């Protein structure tokens, strides 16, 4: 019933997930968009699901990764969900996408390649 505050990094794969976003717009989540690692703007549907409840301030676009990780720090949300497979040139996982620093400001970090786990976390 009661969920933790999340900080979701919205690369290609996470935007692509089939999540009913209107269900979560109301909670304490923040969506950080890495525009540096997604060419266009963020999926129109995700934006619309948040605007619809006046929760459009929960979306943060980010020009630079250094900018994105600074946000993570300052927000200090409980969870931090991401998929490191999007930021590497070699398609696999590399724990070197998340600065060694982050363990200080955030309780739980999910870095997942598998769809179920990502949907499991963001939906509790």
């Amino acid at each position: 019933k009661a969920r933790k505050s999340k900080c979701i990094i919205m690369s290609k794969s996470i935007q692509g997930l089939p999540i009913k976003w209107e269900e979560y717009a109301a909670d304490e989540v923040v969506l950080l968009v890495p525009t540096s690692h997604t060419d266009g703007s963020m999926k129109q549907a995700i934006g619309d699901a948040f605007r619809k409840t006046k929760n459009e301030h929960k979306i943060i676009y980010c020009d630079s990764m250094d900018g994105l990780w600074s946000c993570v720090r300052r927000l200090g949300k409980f969870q931090c969900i991401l998929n490191s497979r999007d930021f590497t040139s070699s398609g696999g996982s590399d724990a070197a996408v998340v600065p060694e620093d982050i363990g200080r400001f955030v309780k739980f970090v999910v870095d997942s390649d598998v769809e179920d786990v990502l949907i499991d976390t963001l939906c509790n």
Binding site: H57, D63, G67, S70
Partner: protein
């Protein structure tokens, strides 16, 4: 002292009342900059409160801000201590958790007793439209600016202010 302090603040209080009561921008240059500046408790002239409106074309636009002013008994030889409410604002030069403000003009080196409370609160306002991030109190917001990530800068601030109201 406290006798030379008190007669200053009484002079300032008159000037504050007069200027803020006008709705004409020649007599009131703080139109839309300073909404109110009064002493918290009429009887205690040493603590004061101001409400400012955030500067245009910044992430602080369209949100008011309450400021605490503490006047020392050795004022105006020494500066007043000025600070925000706790967990009220994110800024390079404001330590959000305490409210503390880094304003160069309030530093012992550069304080001129010519300045009064209105120039001070204005100097706070001026600071929101233009931050110095070489010496920041919020290292994280500082490093955002210091990377030219304006998308993040306006995003996190507008986020903070929006959740402040809810």
């Amino acid at each position: 002292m406290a006798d030379t302090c008190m007669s200053r603040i009484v002079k300032e209080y008159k000037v504050i009342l007069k200027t803020l009561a006008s709705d004409d921008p020649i007599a009131n240059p703080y139109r839309g900059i300073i909404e109110s500046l009064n002493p918290i408790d009429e009887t205690d002239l040493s603590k004061w409160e101001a409400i400012i409106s955030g500067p245009s074309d910044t992430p602080y636009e369209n949100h008011q801000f309450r400021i605490l002013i503490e006047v020392p008994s050795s004022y105006p030889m020494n500066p007043p201590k000025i600070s925000f409410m706790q967990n009220n604002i994110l800024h390079c030069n404001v330590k959000s958790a305490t409210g503390e403000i880094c304003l160069n003009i309030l530093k012992p080196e550069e304080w001129t007793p010519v300045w009064d409370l209105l120039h001070c609160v204005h100097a706070v306002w001026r600071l929101l439209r233009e931050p110095v991030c070489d010496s920041p109190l919020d290292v994280d917001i500082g490093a955002i600016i210091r990377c030219g990530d304006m998308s993040a800068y306006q995003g996190i601030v507008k986020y903070f202010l929006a959740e402040r109201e809810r």
